[PDB]
Amino acid sequence: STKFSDNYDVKEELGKGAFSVVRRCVHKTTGLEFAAKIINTKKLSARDFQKLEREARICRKLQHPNIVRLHDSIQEESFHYLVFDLVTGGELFEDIVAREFYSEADASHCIQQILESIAYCHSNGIVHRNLKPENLLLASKAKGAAVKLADFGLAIEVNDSEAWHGFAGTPGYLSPEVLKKDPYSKPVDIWACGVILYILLVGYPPFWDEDQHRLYAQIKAGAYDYPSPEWDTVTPEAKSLIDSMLTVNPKKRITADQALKVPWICNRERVASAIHRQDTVDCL
Amino acid sequence: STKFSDNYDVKEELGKGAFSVVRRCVHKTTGLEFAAKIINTKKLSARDFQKLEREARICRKLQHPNIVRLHDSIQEESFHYLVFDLVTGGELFEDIVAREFYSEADASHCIQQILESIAYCHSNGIVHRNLKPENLLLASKAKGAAVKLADFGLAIEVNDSEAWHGFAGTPGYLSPEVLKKDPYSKPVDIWACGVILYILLVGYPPFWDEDQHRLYAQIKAGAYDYPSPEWDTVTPEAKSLIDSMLTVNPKKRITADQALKVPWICNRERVASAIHRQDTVDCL
Ligand SMILES: [Mg+2]
Ligand SMILES: [Mg+2]
């Protein structure tokens, strides 16, 4: 109602879009920090509003450390306030660009988190449909910070069967079944995970062509390779996992639950994560 | 029947030949654009008609982004209408002339597409027999536009063996086996690909003589070289690939499938094709 200005202190602007700005805020009585997406609702089109309602509704259900969580959704006179987790680490996209590419150890940890977020969504009947590095946010700048899934604006709710949910997504990450206009479901997100994993390891995507007819033909055929020298020193296990995700027939494609059990993901190299002294916590 | 004028709006003339004109057209109910080759069929000779039937039949089977595709073939009273992909980028011939020659990076991308079109034809039992820059069309003027194979007027359907299919093709691109009048097959097109690749890199052909007896002797012997200074700075990999294609014995000549796996073709220099932000598509 006026439940936002009464309850939160607004701080500095974090970002802006069409019809909205995101500002950091602090809840007054508890001191917890959040990011408030502040939307001018009198200037939203009927479709824009439909998309906001769907995204808030889907987002409110999803509570996992690797999802940017929605904590409150508040309608004031002319503005709507969506109070999300605060993330300060920037997009995974920007981090890949800055680092050029990830070691196998880092890529494995990164895609593990991405797959855990996707497994959690799928177990709750949500298919994201637009997974890409721009939609994955690092919780903070500290190494090991959670990678968190964002932007559920294209997400759909699914049951246990495939359906034609429409042509939507981002071209370099689109799955063959969406490009063929076949009914589809959860596996579309695993194909995008495969694209991301390939990008993590070498810093460029498996499917790239300035002619979109060629690009979509290549995706539909599952036509990609592992060029020298950059792939030369990458393990067969990493490539095999990518192949399992970039499997053209979605019925034969690995699921997120299955991928999380693959040795390359869960065979723990633990010299730098052996036992360590830990401080006591005492909140009594 | 009258299925063309009822279904398409004809626009401006794109080109003309003997017995035909090509005009851009727009399909009325979908709005898609095409190039219609409009042929006066009452003025075609029996052989001309045989060639039209063969070319339409072969062309209708071939669906690949790097082939100028035939979408419909419609007989009206006195005119036949072949509704093809619209290409606005002109012949590869004209683009080579305008640019003089291609960088190794550009030549590699260009011949990759040409080889992909040829590999697709060969896998479908079609040998083009007349591959040359005049028969390769750029889909549009934008850089990276698909290079598309055209003019299947001399194409043949082959099984897994060699046969004598006759003496036909274009002199500077003819293979040694056709000039020797040996049985031949798919490899003839790879020899022409080699001629084209040499032309792409330096802007002139490997075999040129105003005396045709000399020209054909030189081709049959595989007699060409890499003159200074223009070849001086071209990599050994580019030359080795050309040598593999310009291999006189067709049984030892590289195939299109094999050439597409050569590092010079698929070792991706990807600084300018690393990850990039991509827009969402939403057609819902
Ligand atoms: Mg985004
Ligand atoms: Mg021609």
Curated annotation (Swiss-Prot), chains A, B:
Q: What protein name applies here?
A: Calcium/calmodulin-dependent protein kinase type II
* Impact upon substituting R277E: Increase in calcium independent kinase activity and translocation to an unlocalized pool in the neurite. Small decrease in glr-1 trafficking
Give the gene symbol.
unc-43
Q: Where does ATP bind?
A: L14, G15, K16, G17, A18, F19, S20, V21, V22, K37
User: Impact of altering E104K?
Assistant: In n498gf; slight increase in calcium independent kinase activity, no effect on translocation to the neurite. Nuclear translocation of daf-16 resulting in lifespan extension
Location(s), subcellular? Cytoplasm; Cell projection, Axon; Perikaryon
Family of this protein: Belongs to the protein kinase superfamily. CAMK Ser/Thr protein kinase family. CaMK subfamily.
- What positions are modified (Phosphothreonine)? T280
Annotated source species = Caenorhabditis elegans
Q: What is the effect of changing T280D?
A: Constitutively activate kinase activity, increase in translocation to the neurites
Q: What is the tissue localization of expression for this protein? A: Expressed in the nervous system. Observed in the ADF and AWC neurons. Position in AWC neurons is regulated by microtubules. Localized to clusters in ventral cord neurites which appear to be required for glr-1 trafficking. Also present in oocytes.
Q: What is the effect of changing D232R?
A: Increase in calcium independent kinase activity, loss of translocation to neurites and glr-1 trafficking
Top-down, what is the taxonomic lineage of the species of origin?
Answer: Eukaryota, Metazoa, Ecdysozoa, Nematoda, Chromadorea
Query: What stretch of the whole protein does this chain cover?
Result: 5 to 288 of 720
The active site consists of N130 (proton acceptor)
Changing S175L has the effect of: In e408; males display locomotor and muscle seizure defects and egg laying defects
Question: What is the reported phenotype of gene knockout?
Answer: Increased frequency of defecation, typified by a weaker repetition of the defecation motor program, an echo, 10 s after the primary motor program. Abnormal spicule protraction. Lack of tph-1 transcriptional up-regulation during learned olfactory aversion to bacteria. Reduced brood size, body length and width. Lethargic movement. A gain-of function mutation reduces locomotory activity, alters excitation of three muscle types and lengthens the period of the motor output of a behavioral clock. Both classes of mutation inhibit neurotransmitter release.
Q: Where is the Protein kinase domain?
A: 8-265
Q: What does this protein do?
A: Acts in the signaling of a variety of pathways and processes. Phosphorylates 'Ser-319' of daf-16 in response to stress signals, such as heat, starvation and oxidation, which plays a role in prolonging lifespan. Required for viability under chronic osmotic stress in which it acts downstream of osr-1. Has roles in locomotion, oocyte maturation, brood size, egg laying, defecation, meiotic maturation and neuronal cell fate specification. Required for the regulation of synaptic density and neuromuscular junction morphology. Regulates the synaptic trafficking of glr-1.
Q: How does it assemble?
A: Dodecamer. Subunits are tightly packed around a central ring-shaped scaffold with extensive contacts between the regulatory segment of one kinase and the catalytic domain of another enabling cooperative activation of a subunit by the adjacent molecule. Interacts with and phosphorylates daf-16; the interaction promotes daf-16 nuclear localization. Interacts with egl-2 and tir-1. Interacts with nsy-1.
